[PDB]
């Protein structure tokens, strides 16, 4: 499952987490089995405007 | 009885298999009388600002 968030919200991508992203955007199960990988993409997803 | 004893055949006798429990039909919430409203009137409705 691929997507993009802001850094402060990276913590929310984990089982048993709450907040905007966890509650309304992407929710993992409490017994989630697997890996979460996150990396900065400022060079690619940011624009001067 | 067949499943609770883990067999397809049951000998003569009396066995306990489960528990009958009446479920709550609805919910009730009780709190004291609402008093002492915060004086937001004195703020939003002030004659001079």
């Amino acid at each position: 499952d691929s997507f993009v968030i802001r850094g402060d919200e990276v913590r929310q991508i984990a089982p048993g987490q709450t907040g905007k992203i966890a509650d309304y955007n992407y929710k993992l199960p409490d017994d989630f089995t697997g890996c979460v990988i996150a990396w900065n993409s400022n060079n690619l997803d940011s624009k001067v405007g | 009885t067949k499943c609770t004893l883990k067999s397809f055949t049951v000998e003569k006798g009396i066995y306990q298999t489960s528990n009958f429990r009446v479920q709550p039909t609805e919910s009730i919430v009780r709190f004291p009388n609402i008093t002492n409203l915060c004086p937001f009137g004195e703020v939003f409705n002030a004659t001079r600002f």
Binding site: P15, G16, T18, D30 | -
Partner: protein
């Protein structure tokens, strides 16, 4: 007191039950002896523990 033995038997059993019931008031290391409070107060990841 002549019938002590019989009475004694009764007494012992009662105490047992009482003790058992009193065990419902012990936290066993949890934060509260009341299951409902733990369910309503903590998030599932720690309420499960």
């Amino acid at each position: 007191s002549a019938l002590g033995k019989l009475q004694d038997v009764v007494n012992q059993n009662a105490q047992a039950l009482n003790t058992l019931v009193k065990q419902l008031s012990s936290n066993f290391g949890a934060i509260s002896s009341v299951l409902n409070d733990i369910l309503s107060r903590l998030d599932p990841p720690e309420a499960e523990v």
